[PDB]
Design a protein around this ligand. Structure first.
Ligand SMILES: [Cu+2]
Ligand SMILES: [Cu+2]
Lengths: 245, 262, 249, 233, 247, 262
């Protein structure tokens, strides 16, 4: 279908739910849903929820909270304790399931206790107690961008967030100390101009993953990065030859 | 002139023409023309035509058709055999004209059989000879800023390319095989992060043109490119030292010696 | 307060004024003011002014003019001669105050001659601005940078000048006296460098030495351009052309 | 030079510890010249801790200098201090080396074992690398081994158990990296991680090889192939 | 099998010939033959010949000529016109054979008219022209050549064996006086920048430059200068091979 | 003329002079003169003098004096105070002459005490440059230096530190030490050929252009180290070391007018 019929589908689904709770991450999908909900139902029928957790950065949460206020939404912070579950804490291969369970269950309690008809998230085309309307309307990454520019949406988080769990090998126990170590290492690298980066944790070895197109530009920073991540507790600071992923 | 009077000129020409067929590329100018024609004459008086060829990728054909449908237009696909004209197949320096003639001839066949008064294109101020293609934006004295002024004014925000003939030296015969070879090499290079790229074809040699500011970024990919483009059929994969568009970024002395050497 | 009440105060202030002249830079603030004026008073009561001078590039002036026209405004270009004021010519710490004095004084002349009630600028929550009686309507209505963006999305604004282009005086040490020739030398050097793909760049002037500042993340990309930049900037009159090892700032 | 000639003449029958390097090569012929080919045997050790290419180049050079040459084979991994790579392993390895040479020299009637360190008669004659270079050409010597090697144990953490496999893995990886033009290189072994040390001035020249080195060192058994940002040392 | 036995064999064969002419390249093998010939037969029975051609550079001919003087030998330069043979001129895969055939035949004109018994070259462990490889008949391997060179105090030879410029041309493209000079000047310019092992491969209007891959990073600073220099030499397009040297 | 005949010219020249003094810098030229003199005249008639000054590093002095010992030459040190001359101390464009005159007067003052006839230097193609008289070129010195078994010279040319300062600048112990410490730090990093040009608070680093890409990994360490030595701004010259010598034909001629404009 055309973008007009996909948008009309979205409006009808929203009109029928009447009052919604929106899982708000700050990326372009969730920003589109949140802004479409506000324009169809108005601020007082839309609660935006932003998850605050130890597995994502303080910077991403702060920008999301302020982004929802900029979009004109009542925004709420909720705090998740992902490490309270033994599967997540010990970083087993199915941790994604226990983490997403804890998230949507908290979001269901929020929407149940404020009278919302569903929880909305930003899943698109190409979690059963969530409605992903963009995927129900057959939106693709191309469509979300087309519809966002039409509404004048302009200020979402342009770099993808993933849980810090992925920086640790399966079986490694996540702790406050070693999560903080990875977060400070990745934060410093982003501060040098590398928004997409991974510091993979191998105890005394840091393995840095960069997009291969940036590795040439990184050379000027070797020695400063070496000394900075050593001051954080790594003994060996390395650059992965395979690049990012 | 004022932007308000240039628009009134454009509507007068549209209202007077009653039924039109628009060559629609997906760029801002063809998008403006199509949307003004749709707004002045209504959906059942406007056929949007999108051309599919061997000289362009299927992806641009798909995105042009999606843009015309999203504008709410009756859209028609037509596919051309550019390689059946030997001025084009043998790639002489004027193939651009014989290609545009073949294109405008098919568009005038479409306009004759659907009862439209003219064929419209999106050429602005700063082929039609024998066809009768009217560039109403240029007839109403539109400039690139005026097209954007009217496009924001009408709520247009979603618009989208060069013929593959430019990748071959004059006299080299274009074939389905060597066209596909060039298109795949350019696509693979784009997938590595180089959106502006040309793979110039010299039979068994591939000559890659890059913006000079990216050549340093490219080195990590040399061996992968070399082996990828060798599997695409090139024997030698090379990088042009002048980069993409030679001379533009040189100093006033060697810009003048790089132009004299052309 | 809410966005919509600060919007209403802003609409009220415009309605009373009827005819306005807008100092238009192209950044998010000036474009917000200009767009609120166009939508409250109509195109025929809103003159947008863009200043042209020796201390800024022809490229930034042309984009500001094109942005105002593209947003649907009647736009006017005014050329200021900042080097005729001794305070600016001598490159002292108060040169900016005299430059903005000369700007607001010209804008009050443009506004008298087209029948405008106020001069509007894009300041949000300064001595020259008040003395000239120019109005910061966003600042009166208690806008902050987040409100400016909230309102700009609400109105569908998505192009403004994201670069904060800076006066060329910052390329000279305090006390070095600006001339037409050494300004032109630096301006051509930065224009040449931007044309190679380096949009954020400074050519600091140390008499016969040019000291180029690049973001450290770009210096590797620069290597292929060493010899061309060396000869181009010498042909502009520098004896020595150098690259700062510390980078930008 | 006068000092060196004095000491060798007095030693009558000698055996030379032959490294293949320029210093060691001086001592062999320097001696062959004053004591005769029949009473100077050159021994070159074959081990798992040094490369086959360095062993093969040394022995043929001793014949090239005109010497009775012997290859003795040392099993350094038979010592538990070496096998487990403790901080004093250099001492237990050096004992096994010089003890095998004192067996060969005792057995063939050699009066001493000599090596090339600047008994180190070259160290006794106040030689430095420059003095060694002028005198070596002086007898028309032009062929040694220009790369002076270090034991493969330094590629392993203290406490890591050396095995035939993990040594071979390290040796093939460094051999590949040298083949690409990086003669000074270390492949430090961290189980599934390979950590490459290059001189910092070569790291830029290396970029063109990232992807090939990654795949080559994985096919050698590493899961992750990395480059140390601090560089060589 | 010993070196001494191999040396004596070489000495015996030289004594037998009495008057010889040596094809002298400057490499270590041709230097060993020349020095052993001078020692066993004396200066007036040994002619050293150095070939001069369009297929090699002038400074490479001069360095071999000056090295032959350093050994104390009467050396004469001879110049070959390789481009006169169509097998070489049109660059067929057997062009190497006709060049070397033309080479050894000129050496036999010189050896006939100076009364020499054989033409000697340095092949180690031709057959048409009767040229003798005494190092090959004396069972020399690279280590024997090196051992004997040290014995005689030989330390000066060409360590970089030069290759005919024919390898810069594809099979079938015809060599001309101009396109050789074009390729040789291009390579000379690239060496002057600090890149000693390099090839400028010729593809009509395209130059395909081969560099060792580990130097390609170092090359970037010269791109534009190399581009314009080789265009001023007559190439329309100047390119760098992504596969590197001997791709 | 072969090496053989030019060497005999040199050997003939040495025998006639009987007693010599050799200006020994440690480069390839002086080492050839010094080693040829000993082989013609013996250790009892070849006085070698090596100069120590404030304009050169202690590393050069010690490296030069050690070599004369290897060549078996009687070698003595002499110390020159170049900073006592106002032409050298204030670095005017003829500073080079008054420095070389002050050098040669010490070398001839010594000549009489030695009892030597002439004083010899390594000038190639009352001083005497026998290599220059015998028609030696840079290539001839290399061939004869191998034939005589010499492989020690100082392989990188060293020049007086005066060239690191603009004409008119007063040389001091403070600024000389600053320039020398900056250069030694850069040499310590793997760049044996380097210059730190002194422009008051600006350091301008000259590198051979083939090394500049290799330098990027040290930008930050060099920036901070040279600031600690007293420079405010640390910069890299875009023209490099010996600007123009390695440029294409057109742009070499253009950088040569740029040079001669000052
Ligand atoms: Cu880059
Ligand atoms: Cu390098």
């Amino acid at each position: 279908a055309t973008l007009a019929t996909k948008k009309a589908t979205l409006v009808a689904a929203l009109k029928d739910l009447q009052r919604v709770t929106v899982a708000f991450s700050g990326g372009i999908d969730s920003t589109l849903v949140l802004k479409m909900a506000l324009d169809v139902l108005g601020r007082d029928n839309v609660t935006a929820v932003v998850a605050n957790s130890e597995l994502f950065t303080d910077e991403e949460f702060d920008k999301a909270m302020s982004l929802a206020e900029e979009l004109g939404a009542n925004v709420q912070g909720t705090t998740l304790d992902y490490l309270s579950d033994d599967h997540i804490k010990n970083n087993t291969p199915d941790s994604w399931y226990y983490a997403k369970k804890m998230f949507y269950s908290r979001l269901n309690d929020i929407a149940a206790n404020n009278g919302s008809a569903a929880v909305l998230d930003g899943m698109i085309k190409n979690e059963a107690g969530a409605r992903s309307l963009l995927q129900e309307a057959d939106f693709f990454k191309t469509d979300v961008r087309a519809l966002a520019q039409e509404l004048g949406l302009t200020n979402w988080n342009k770099v993808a967030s993933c849980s810090v769990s992925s920086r640790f090998p399966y079986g490694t126990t996540l702790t406050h100390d070693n999560i903080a170590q990875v977060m400070a290492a990745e934060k410093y690298l982003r501060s040098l101009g590398f928004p997409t980066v991974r510091v993979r944790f191998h105890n005394d070895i840091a393995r840095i993953e960069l997009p291969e197109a940036r590795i040439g530009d990184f050379l000027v920073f070797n020695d400063r990065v070496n000394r900075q991540l050593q001051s954080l507790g790594f003994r060996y600071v390395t650059l992965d030859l395979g690049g990012f992923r």
